[PDB]
Amino acid sequence: AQYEDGKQYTTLEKPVAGAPQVLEFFSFFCPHCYQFEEVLHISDNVKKKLPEGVKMTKYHVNFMGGDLGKDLTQAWAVAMALGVEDKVTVPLFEGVQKTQTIRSASDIRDVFINAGIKGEEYDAAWNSFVVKSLVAQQEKAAADVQLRGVPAMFVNGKYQLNPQGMDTSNMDVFVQQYADTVKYLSEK
């Protein structure tokens, strides 16, 4: 075929019922994730090719960066609750990997303050039980697929993207092949 299990994707032996349609996992400590966000805009280009009516979900993971990794998962929960993903994603990546000015939860918070979220509003979210269940959701979804690496994308809880099996000579061609694969898997 032109899309083969084991080449542009793999199949989960243990499929995940009720999973989000398109589920992406990342870490702000993850170097390919930085690329995926900053240089390739994967999430965006996938969105652009997806069928009408399909929702896109993105979760942070704990297994990179120890204590700060978890803080970052709680902060992403805050970002999802407040709807400010698009305002903090870039400065969090650069703060962790580029400038290395994020070293504590307070530094994470600073990114949000500079992005215009109010202290009171951030601290209230940070401490809310809505944010705790959102943290719970992120961990559960990662647990359900035995996730040990990022970036990772799963389609309909049965298929896992395999970017290793696509060509990387051309960044733009890599992205389209990636997105077209998500679309193909989506229609499967």
What secondary-structure arrangement, pairings included, does this model have?
Elements: E1 9-11, E2 22-26, H1 31-38, H2 42-47, E3 56-60, H3 66-82, H4 85-98, H5 105-114, H6 119-126, H7 129-144, E4 152-155, E5 159-161, H8 171-187
Parallel strand pairs: 2-3
Antiparallel strand pairs: 1-5, 2-4, 4-5
Helix pairs in contact: 1-4, 3-7
PDB class: oxidoreductase
Keywords: disulfide oxidoreductase, redox protein, dsba, oxidoreductase
Assembly: monomeric
Summarize it:
It is classed as oxidoreductase. Keywords: redox protein, dsba. The protein is an alpha+beta fold.
Characterize the main sheet: 5 strands, mixed
Helix content: 40-55%
CATH superfamily, please?
Glutaredoxin
- Please, how many domains? 1
At CATH level 2, the architecture is 3-Layer(aba) Sandwich
Report the count of strand segments: 5
Supply the number of helical segments.
8
- Would you list the SSEs in sequence order as H and E? EEHHEHHHHHEEH
What is the third-level CATH name, the topology?
Glutaredoxin
User: Strand order across the biggest sheet?
Assistant: 1-5-4-2-3
The first-to-last residue Cα distance is 14 Å
Kindly estimate the percentage of residues that lie in beta strands according to DSSP: 5-15%
Q: How large is the radius of gyration?
A: 17 Å
- Give the helix/strand class: alpha+beta
Oligomer kind: monomer
Please state the overall shape, judged from the principal axes of the Cα atoms.
globular
